[PDB]
Amino acid sequence: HWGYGKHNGPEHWHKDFPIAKGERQSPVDIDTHTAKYDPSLKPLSVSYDQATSLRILNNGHAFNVEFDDSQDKAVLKGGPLDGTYRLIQFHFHWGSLDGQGSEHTVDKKKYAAELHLVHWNTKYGDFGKAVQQPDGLAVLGIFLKVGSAKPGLQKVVDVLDSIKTKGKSADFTNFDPRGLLPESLDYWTYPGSLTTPPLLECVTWIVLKEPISVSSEQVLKFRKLNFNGEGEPEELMVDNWRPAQPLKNRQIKASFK
Secondary structure (H helix, E strand, C coil), X not given: CCCCCCCCCHHHHHHCCHHHHCCCCCCCEECCCCCEECCCCCCEEEECCCCCEEEEEECCCCEXXXXXXXXXXXXXXXXXXXXXXXXXXXXXXXXXCCCCCCCCEECCECCCEEEEEEEEEHHHCCHHHHCCCCCCEEEEEEEXXXXXXXXXXXXXXXXXXXXXXXXXXXXXXXXXXXXXCXXXXXXXXXEECCCCCCCCCCEEEEEECCCEEECHHHHHHHCCCECCCCCCCCCECCCCCCCCCCCCCCCCEECCC
């Protein structure tokens, strides 16, 4: 099945998922000089005060922090969006070394990691229905650089030892995703896709300009995770990023001058 190796990685995905060669694939390189300021874009509204995290999962690709999405508890609105989008999960993509790891790039710069907060449009009732719509999902993307520790990340880091291998989960209640956001909510936005199979072209991307800082020790803990299951040959969970895809007939818009 798909993964990140030489034999199953991103250049192979098109054989099982032909939309991989589609018109609105993600990630992309954000050319800061050609993204245009759009004064019609609104500030983003991130309302995570009542978010209810439940569990963390090693799915064999990354780890997912899952939320209770059975009410409007953690919602994204505004920005480029029409209506209300509910938080369902977050996850990261990261590198083997600090010079790579992000999916989006900024003027070809790769960050050490990238966080995706995934939200689905409430007008479609559930996530599985939402991913079938061109405006079904809104993903908030946040870059990670290595420097000072991010205190709000440490609870995640702490728990990773308990989910080392594919298929392991653990209770992860009471985690506050607000502690993962940068100070500014300035963003770029464009229409794209999920960055893992099935690669569905259902996402409004909102990529924050300001990276968060995490420490080398935090990132190093991500790189101790395993893509394999218990008792199988160890293959470190690193380099679980899809490279930038062709922009095609798309515009990237900036919320800021």
